[PDB]
Amino acid sequence: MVLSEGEWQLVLHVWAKVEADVAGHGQDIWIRLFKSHPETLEKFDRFKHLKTEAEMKASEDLKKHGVTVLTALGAILKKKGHHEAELKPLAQSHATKHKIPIKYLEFISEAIIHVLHSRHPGNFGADAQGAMNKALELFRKDIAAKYKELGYQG
Ligand code: HEM
């Protein structure tokens, strides 16, 4: 797929608000994911033991990890499609070490969209959401392709 410059602009416009509080957005997203699709929490030997939302909120480790994830994703979005180098190390670890199915990347995509919709209604109307969804689909398609080359696909 290819986004237009206008679609990238909508994406990087909301993302700039997200970057006002990276750790707080990281928290909401992971907590949204873990509550909605609890099976995803099983992938983290680090976080598996967390029983409640209150425990998740209070985990300093989880908050650091959310900042690591959103900074990696932010660096990809700012490439505006030219993200091949960034994608390589991320595809290799998630396919080969962590073993994360494309399905789970769809689930977190959903969690990111939910959280931007709640926090940023003014900057996340239908068009901006359409553009963010396009950007994350692009991300998933390219990652899926890399999975396949690395011998995991799926
Ligand atoms: C927007 C999508 C994602 C991004 C950009 C991302 C990024 C990262 C980064 C940058 C790291 C640290 C370096 C590395 O191991 O590659 C990491 C580690 C990890 N990621 Fe992700 N990730 C994403 C989605 C997911 C999902 C959906 C799962 C599982 C449901 C997953 C599970 C893990 C695991 C298990 C680790 C290791 C955590 C640890 O013990 O430190 N990732 N991820």
UniProtKB/Swiss-Prot annotation:
It holds the Pfam family Globin. It catalyses: Fe(III)-heme b-[protein] + nitric oxide + H2O = Fe(II)-heme b-[protein] + nitrite + 2 H(+); H2O2 + AH2 = A + 2 H2O. The modification Phosphothreonine is found at residue 68. Changing residue 122 to A: In metmyoglobin. Residues 2-148 form the Globin domain. Belongs to the globin family. Monomeric heme protein which primary function is to store oxygen and facilitate its diffusion within muscle tissues. Reversibly binds oxygen through a pentacoordinated heme iron and enables its timely and efficient release as needed during periods of heightened demand. Depending on the oxidative conditions of tissues and cells, and in addition to its ability to bind oxygen, it also has a nitrite reductase activity whereby it regulates the production of bioactive nitric oxide. This is Myoglobin. It comes from Physeter macrocephalus (Sperm whale). The gene is MB.
